[PDB]
Structures are given as C-alpha cells and as structure tokens.
C-alpha cells in the first residue's frame, strides 16, 4: 500500500516484558519500576474461570505463589495487591530499562500499537484502533494476555491497553492500565457478545485527506453536502455519525489541502454509493478507518 | 492469523544512525565499527541525473560525512564503497550490536521495515517484496536508508535498504551488500518496472491460516490440476504456481487436513465468482503478504 499502518518502534516496551506464573497458568506481565502489572485471571484455573470469586481465591495465595521472570533473570516478588482486573505485584528489583511513562485511557476510535507477547517473550508488534464496540480485532497470538497497547510521544510511552479476554470470533477484550475494562466486558469464561461494530468515519476522512496529500484526487467532486444529509447516508452503509465536534478535528487537514470537510463528505458519499469501480486510493481497494487525524499529520 | 504484524524492532532501533554529506541527510546502519548507507548521499539534486560515484567520492575526505547516534556524534575514520552502498568506518564499535546476518531474499518473501527520518526511528510495518522487486509506500513509509529485516532467535537477518522512490509511488532498494533487487539503478531517471502480480503462494498460505482459525466457508468438493489452476491465475494476474510452491505448503496441508491442489480449486472459485461480500479472516479482499513460514509462526 501507498500508506502503511505503522506501529511504534517497540524498543522502549520490549524491555518491560516478563512472564507471570501462578500454579499452571502463565501469561505476560508489564514490569515498571518495582511493580509487575498482569491480568488478575492468572490466579484462576481452567475450572475457576467459570465463576471466579477473585478476592476469595487471591487470599489463598502468597508472595511465593508467583513466578515472575524477566528473560533468564528471576524476580523475587515481595508484595501483591489487586486493582480492578489487574494484579499488582511488588518486586525486590527495580526495572533499569523503564522508559519515561504515563497511564492513559484512550477513546473509542483512537489508535495504538500492541506488542503481542508469547509467554513473556515478545513475538511481534502491530498497529490497531479501539473499535466503536470497545473491542480489538485479532487471532491466536495477536493478543496474548498481558500484551500491552501503547503510544509513544517522543520519549514518553503512554500505556493504554492490556489484553485480557478472547471473544468467540477472534475479537479481543481488554482493560486499561488501572484494571478498568473497555466497554461492557468481564474477566470470566462465559457467553460474551460484541456490539454492532461500525466504520470510524473520522479516521476514514483523515485517510482521504492523507490520500489527497499523496496526489490521489480522482474521488473529489464539485457537489457540496450538508452535515445532516451525510449522516443519513453514513448510517445507511454502517458508518459512525459525523458530529460537529469531528469537523473541528479535521480543520488542520482541511486547511493543509484547502478542501472543506463537507466537500470531502460529498466525496465519501459517492464512494459509498458507487465504490472505487476498478480504481484505487493509496494502493487500497477498501476504505481504511484505522488512521486517526493525529496519525496522518504525524506521518505526512 | 488476522494481523500483518512486524518483528519487534528493539534490537534494530539501536543500530540506526543518520549520515549527513553536503546538503543531504539520510538513514544509516551502524553495525560493529562500520556504517552502511545509500551511496547516493554524496550526490546533489543535479548530480543524480547522471551520477559518477567514483569521481564524486574521490574528492571527498573523511570530514565530508557527519554521523551521529542519537546525540553522540561518531568520528568517521575511513570510507570505502561497496556496490551501491557507502561503507564508513567509525572510531567505535556499536555497543548495541546484536547477532546479525546479511541475506538476499526471493521476490514474494516478507520482512519488517524500520522507517526512519534522519536517524530517528519513526514507525515499523510488515511488508512483502513484490514480484517486480519493489515495495509500495509514501514519503515517510521508508525514507532512504531505512532497513528491512527478519528475526530468528538471537540473530537479526538484514535483507533490505531503501534507496529510490519511483514515479509510480513504489520503492527500490538493495541487499546490505549493495546489489539492487530488480533492474533498478541509483540514478534519477525513468525505470521500467515489471508487472506487479499477486503472490499465489502467499494467498494459499493465508487461506490455510483461515481454515486453522475455523473460517472455512470457501471450501468445496471441487478439484483442479496445477495446470488448470494457472490458466485461471494468469487471467486474474496471479503469478503461476510451481511444484516448488506446492512442496512448501506440504506441512500446512497435513496439519489442516486439506490437500494443496484442493485449496487451489477453493481459490479458483473465489477468483472467478468474487467473495459474495463475505469475509475470510475479517478481510473483504484476499491477502498476499503472509508466507507459509509466517502463518506457522503465528499459531
């Protein structure tokens, strides 16, 4: 493609990955300073996940009930507390590879990088968006419990995600770095359904501007639509409503190109009605919605 | 699986430097005491029309190149030229040098690229070497000197460095030896590129990936020959499937329980009739940037 969906360089996070073992269960952990962050469902067995009373089970454990390991180096755990759906493990050694960090809660439609980690060891990095239905798309390895989502601003890593659950159909449900879930999910193996997932209009529009800056112009027209007219057609083709709050955000990209939001909205309208019809936008034959206006400006 | 993910770039990030010569500044690969970069930095905008690298380099001293790692600027104490690359010896061995190898990959194979803007690592993505020996992208999707690599345990296998942006929007590069992929040359001119076919081998691997993940609505009871398949493939711009290709998918074929040639008859139908608006692994369009090796790695 002419526009690559780029993850952040995973270096500053690679050095923060460990494995957390409790009984037979083993998953990834985030080692920052003298604390290891991991999903709380680690203390549960395959049987315990059916209906887990965590406080009831966690009390049956002690510091030594936890195998934390950074590569070959073994970490002595000297305390444990529970914060929502996270396990907070206090360790005897502080992490010398700790980057300048922050904990954030991203909005649906916002993007980040996920470092998929296989039993403490990192395996790969990809870029994604928090879908409107509060889920992350994925597979067997895409989200291995404890694998984290992050943005890197200059030298500051802002952790926003942690994989916790895999839904029925390769859909991943997780938590922020406070243990608070994203959307209406819970950490227990029962029947969980995803909501009506929609296409993030704001990001698609940004991508069309990204398109324009790279010379691609064939989709642009003379017609000019109203905001209300657009939302009608948007909802028809399963697109997220465009709010007035959204058009303010496209301002910078609009200025950059001299193409008003609504005029670009009359272009998207025709693209929804008619499609590419043999043609391409930035190498793609489909309309990408995983590029936030921030990502575009940053990468252009 | 679903996501086209790249290898973690931590080991590679610490190998990136910038190299300034004259008015140009690009990305460079710092391994041990050497630095590798596109030899064309020494050229001006005009020089690139008909460059003479021998003549241009001869009146360049060691001072002409300015190499800095993050902030700490390296002193360049020697400059040779290997093919289309610049080999600048610096006064220091990279303290962050990983176990590494140089390799030259076949067209249709995959690797991670670390895009960089003047030494600073920007982003990371996964891509495949197109059959016409190119890589698609924008301006920042691989600013020159950016490196392509794979990771096998302790070792980093470097395979690509960006050199040229072509008219069409595609990119040409070399192996970390200095030899271009395809019929491309490091001078600013028109460049006849080969037809960009669809990687049959990769589409098939990706269809096996779907089966493994419980996505099998595109299977049929129909059959085909390798010969009958390619006449449909050639028509829809898919490059011919070879016996060699059929052998590589053997392991996947066992595992999945579906024979290679049947999976071709499964593909044959999807190429002819479209997808009816359905999804294979959440995708509406067939993917071809996943090798058989990639599929097995991510399961």
From Swiss-Prot, chain A:
Changing residue 189 to P: In strain: Isolate BJ02. Cleaves the C-terminus of replicase polyprotein at 11 sites. Recognizes substrates containing the core sequence [ILMVF]-Q-|-[SGACN]. Also able to bind an ADP-ribose-1''-phosphate (ADRP). May cleave host ATP6V1G1 thereby modifying host vacuoles intracellular pH. Residues 1-300 are cytoplasmic. It catalyses: TSAVLQ-|-SGFRK-NH2 and SGVTFQ-|-GKFKK the two peptides corresponding to the two self-cleavage sites of the SARS 3C-like proteinase are the two most reactive peptide substrates. The enzyme exhibits a strong preference for substrates containing Gln at P1 position and Leu at P2 position. It is found in: Host cytoplasm; Host Golgi apparatus. The active site is at 41 (for 3cl-pro activity), 145 (for 3cl-pro activity). Exists as monomer and homodimer. Only the homodimer shows catalytic activity. The chain holds residues 3241 to 3540 of 4382 of the full protein. Residues 1-300 form the Peptidase C30 domain. This is 3C-like proteinase nsp5.
């Amino acid at each position: 493609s002419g526009f690559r969906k780029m993850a952040f360089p995973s270096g500053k996070v690679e050095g923060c990955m460990v494995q957390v073992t409790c009984g037979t269960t083993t998953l990834n952990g985030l080692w920052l300073d003298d604390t290891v962050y991991c999903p709380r469902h680690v203390i549960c067995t395959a049987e315990d996940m059916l209906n887990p009373n965590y406080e009831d089970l966690l009390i049956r454990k002690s510091n030594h009930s936890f195998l934390v390991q950074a590569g070959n180096v073994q970490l002595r755990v000297i305390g444990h507390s529970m914060q929502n759906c996270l396990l907070r493990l206090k360790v005897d050694t502080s992490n010398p590879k700790t980057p300048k960090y922050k904990f954030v809660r991203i909005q649906p439609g916002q993007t980040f990088s996920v470092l998929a980690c296989y039993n403490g060891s990192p395996s790969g990095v990809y870029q994604c968006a928090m879908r409107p239905n509060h889920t992350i798309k994925g597979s067997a390895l895409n989200g291995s419990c404890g694998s984290v989502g992050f943005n890197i601003d200059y030298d500051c890593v802002s952790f926003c995600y942690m994989h916790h659950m895999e839904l029925p159909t390769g859909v991943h449900a997780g938590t922020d770095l406070e243990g608070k879930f994203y959307g209406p999910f819970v950490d227990r193996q029962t029947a969980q359904a995803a909501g009506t997932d929609t296409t993030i209009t704001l990001n698609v529009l940004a991508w069309l501007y990204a398109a324009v800056i790279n010379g691609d112009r064939w989709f642009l027209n003379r017609f000019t639509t109203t905001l209300n007219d657009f939302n009608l057609v948007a909802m028809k083709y399963n697109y997220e409503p465009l709010t007035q709050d959204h058009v303010d955000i496209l301002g910078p990209l609009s200025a950059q190109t001299g193409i008003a939001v609504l005029d670009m909205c009359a272009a998207l309208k025709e693209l929804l009605q008619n499609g590419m019809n043999g043609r391409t936008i930035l190498g793609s034959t489909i309309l990408e919605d995983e590029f936030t206006p921030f990502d575009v400006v940053r990468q252009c």
